[PDB]
Amino acid sequence: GAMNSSNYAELFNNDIKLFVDDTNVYRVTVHKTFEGNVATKAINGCIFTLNPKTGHLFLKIIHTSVWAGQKRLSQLAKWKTAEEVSALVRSLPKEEQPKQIIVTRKAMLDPLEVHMLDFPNIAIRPTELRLPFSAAMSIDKLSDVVMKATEPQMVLFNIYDDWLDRISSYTAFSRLTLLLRALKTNEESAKMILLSDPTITIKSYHLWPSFTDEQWITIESQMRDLILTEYGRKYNV
């Protein structure tokens, strides 16, 4: 069934599972044409496929050439996502194939289900959580690799850097989702909070700064304050 607040700890048991988020697969700029009509220009996108227990991220870059000469691209985007996810699963050894795939948007269920018919024992699940994975292109290194790509390309990251060396998956996922939630609601402020101090650097093989434990506590409090501030502003509360 659906994933919600109640069965939230299942993300961190030892059943292999992947989140799939398609929000950044088909990305466009909207502009005016010489004649004053509106047109879109696609830019590169990505499928964000993430093991929430281990941090392993499978970032499938979607090159604009995928769209060439195709109609109804927003619909096609869902099927391309499902195709790529299915191929990822086929590429993985049996003992690494997920037992579940949780799609962040219900519109991916039928596309993935159809693409996964060869894997009847992999369960395709929706979620009621309002996960902030669209904000993944707010992570500078992920955005840079997507925008520089010249061809379809799969790039592998650990989205938790080395945090699991010191904290649990549950805590790591909570940190990740707080950071991304903050980046979604107010990117400029979120990013200011993360880089303000130039003595805290990002390792070449990491996505986030090498905060100490105490500095992560200050950071997380700053991110929480940001999110609450923006809420009051949005709703005048």
Binding site: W79, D110, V114, L117
Partner: protein, 300 residues
């Protein structure tokens, strides 16, 4: 014109013959139905005055034998049987007519309803869906489940409709995932018509039989099956023109005949709104669309 005599009527029962029905009282001198039109299948069905649960009945074709009804007080139901002694059977039928203890199949001459509802229904195909090869007629009731229902428990009592499943390997060619799911033409025309049903008539026959079982017995799995076969056609971009025109006629008479009070449970809102208004074939069911809008605009 053929006859189905009844040995007696021991329990109060509503008797249906095709789209007609009569109330018969406990131990009323009722002894059968006459003037049944040769050339079509027919269904005789029952609903006991005491158990408005379990409607049941028998599909038959009088060209295939002499059939009669006899109440069984052990099993507590009106049973169809075959009389193999043609002479003994003409003798019963004549004596009962002479005493005028038989109702007349009450067909209006202008009325093609039953033909229109059963055009492609063929007794030999019914007997493959309802498998009971020692009888030439077929029992169906309210509670019988279909093979597909059984997959998601007694196989002897199952409705062996053709399994249709839009998210199956059968339905979806590898490498044409998105195409085949959005445009079911290959599932309809290659897999189902050319492969399994062999022709559109057998397909329409199963579709009409499923409808009639849902209507007459409130058989839920038949209703699922009827909607599935409709949807498969409406969700195919490439359908022979002769099948669309015939489908419009089939559906029109099914919608026309359905009891108004049952439109809630018998008509799947999603399917019908998708077939009439979203599907490739939205524009191809003009009579069915017109009757649906004028009779059940709520559902839409």
């Amino acid at each position: 014109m053929n006859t189905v005599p009844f040995t007696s009527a021991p329990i109060e029962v509503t008797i249906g013959i095709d789209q007609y029905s009569f109330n018969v009282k406990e131990n009323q001198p009722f002894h059968g139905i006459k003037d049944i039109p040769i050339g079509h299948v027919h269904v005789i069905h029952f609903q006991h005055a005491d158990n408005s649960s379990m409607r049941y009945g028998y599909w038959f074709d009088c060209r295939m034998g002499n059939f009669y009804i006899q109440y069984d007080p052990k099993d507590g139901l009106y049973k169809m049987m075959e009389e193999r002694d043609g002479a003994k059977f003409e003798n019963i039928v004549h004596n009962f007519k002479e005493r005028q203890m038989m109702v007349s199949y009450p067909k209006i001459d202008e009325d093609d309803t039953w033909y229109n509802l059963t055009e492609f229904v063929q007794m030999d195909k019914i007997r493959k869906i309802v498998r009971k090869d020692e009888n030439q007629f077929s029992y169906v009731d309210s509670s019988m489940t279909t093979v597909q229902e059984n997959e998601l428990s007694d196989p002897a009592h199952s409705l062996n409709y053709t399994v249709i499943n839009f998210k199956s390997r059968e339905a979806i060619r590898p490498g044409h995932e998105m195409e085949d799911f959005l445009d079911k033409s290959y599932y309809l025309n290659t897999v189902m018509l050319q492969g399994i049903f062999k022709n559109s008539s057998n397909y329409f026959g199963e579709l009409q039989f499923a409808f009639l079982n849902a209507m007459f017995f409130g058989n839920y799995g038949s209703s699922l099956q009827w909607h599935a076969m409709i949807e498969l056609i409406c969700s195919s971009a490439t359908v022979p023109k002769h099948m669309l025109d015939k489908l419009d006629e089939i559906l029109y008479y099914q919608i026309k005949t359905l009891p108004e009070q049952y439109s809630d449970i018998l008509l799947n809102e999603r399917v019908w709104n998708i077939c009439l208004y979203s599907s490739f074939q939205k524009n191809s069911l003009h009579n069915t669309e017109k009757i649906m809008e004028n009779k059940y605009p709520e559902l839409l």
